[PDB]
């Protein structure tokens, strides 16, 4: 279940000939930097069923060339990428390899990751509590803390005596920790009466049943 991951092969750009003028570049008398950056994106619309390979090339701050498997050959996003488009598209040996990568790289790799990344599940830790201290200036914020969960697919809703509170909701949105876990705070703004019961419901794939916490 530990097959070897495949990588998209980088192609050699050709120089010697050509040069562009007036490179409308921010400049800004700061420290000159030069970056060759490439992103090969495998998009899966339903597992390997349908796939789209999107390769994008950036020189410094601009995308100057790409390869979209929906098109089948390279296209220049800016003039600076025009020479490479013409060169690689002329190499049929290469255009084939690239087209094949949707299978040899994208689908290949997906099958490997489908064994541990696609099914990764970490159940959220759900907590509810009153915001601030006692002094209630104008509102009394109720915090529903949902943390340490994965994937990001989650639904956090507030209820007041069974009714779902739409307005008065304040969220930090989905927060990515960079370590394969997310966290979020969904706060409710209300004006309690007496025997008013508030509930935070959390739905997430890791769960077999929604999770509710009352206050």
């Amino acid at each position: 279940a530990a097959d070897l991951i495949a990588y998209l092969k980088q192609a050699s750009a050709k120089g010697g000939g050509g040069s562009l003028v007036g490179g409308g570049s921010g400049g800004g008398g700061s420290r000159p930097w030069f970056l060759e950056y490439c992103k090969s994106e495998c998009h899966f619309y339903n597992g390997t069923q349908r796939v789209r390979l999107l390769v994008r090339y950036f020189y410094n701050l601009e995308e100057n060339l790409r390869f979209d498997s929906d098109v089948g050959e390279f296209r220049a996003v800016t003039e600076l990428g025009r020479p490479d488009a013409e060169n690689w598209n002329s190499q049929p040996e290469f255009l084939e390899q690239k087209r094949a990568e949707v299978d040899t790289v994208c689908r290949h790799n997906y099958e490997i990751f489908d064994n541990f990344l696609v099914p990764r599940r970490v159940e959220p830790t759900v907590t509810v509590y009153p915001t601030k201290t006692q002094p209630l200036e104008h509102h009394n914020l109720l915090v529903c803390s949902v943390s340490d969960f994965y994937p990001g697919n989650i639904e956090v809703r507030w209820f007041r005596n069974g009714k779902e509170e739409k307005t008065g909701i304040v969220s930090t949105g989905l927060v990515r920790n960079g370590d394969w876990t997310f966290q979020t705070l969904v706060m409710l703004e209300t004006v309690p009466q007496s025997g008013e019961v508030y509930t935070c419901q959390v739905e997430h794939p890791s769960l077999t049943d929604p999770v509710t916490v009352e206050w």
Partner: protein, 182 residues
């Protein structure tokens, strides 16, 4: 059911720093990157190793091409440069903070370029070099980068943290504070 996912092979080479990177991303998170020097594969989470493997040499071969290509791009544009793009910094706890319970502080560096930065964790005004870790330069949807720095800590009302970040696109270093808020 319909599984929608994105795997991105992100690589780059930068001058004059002479630095490169090669990593894989899954729905926004790092699966692994290759240490260009050691020439070894580094899995974001240890547990990933038992399910797959990657020949590091592949990353280095590609970096060599990215390196050669970088030179061509510089010739093709008469070494014209763009402006440096400063990052936005955000500090935050990984999870809810309870006094006495081990936790982790996160210094999130976002939307910047080139992929080079200097980060320093500060606890009570002093640089902390123990219990810190960081991610390589992570990709965004655009052409900019993001990075995560981490500091292990024990919540307390007597400690005061600062994440000091420096970039060629900043006039003065960016300094973000964080302390236990009840």
């Amino acid at each position: 059911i319909k599984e929608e996912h994105t795997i991105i092979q992100a690589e780059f080479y930068l001058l004059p720093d002479k630095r490169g990177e090669f990593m894989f991303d899954f729905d926004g998170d790092e699966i692994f990157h290759v240490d260009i020097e050691k020439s070894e594969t580094i899995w974001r989470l240890e547990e990933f190793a038992k399910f797959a493997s990657f020949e590091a040499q592949g990353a280095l071969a590609n970096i060599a091409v990215d390196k050669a290509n970088l030179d061509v791009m510089k010739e093709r544009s008469n070494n014209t440069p763009d402006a440096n793009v400063a990052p936005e910094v955000t500090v935050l706890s990984r999870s809810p903070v309870n006094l006495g319970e081990p936790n982790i502080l996160i210094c999130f560096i976002d939307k910047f370029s080139p992929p080079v930065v200097n980060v320093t964790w500060l606890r009570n005004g002093r640089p902390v070099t123990e219990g810190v870790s960081e991610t390589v330069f992570l990709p965004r949807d655009d052409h900019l980068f993001r990075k995560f720095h981490y500091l292990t800590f024990l919540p307390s009302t007597d400690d005061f943290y600062d994440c000091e970040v420096d970039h060629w696109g900043l006039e003065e270093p960016l300094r973000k504070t964080w302390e236990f808020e009840e």
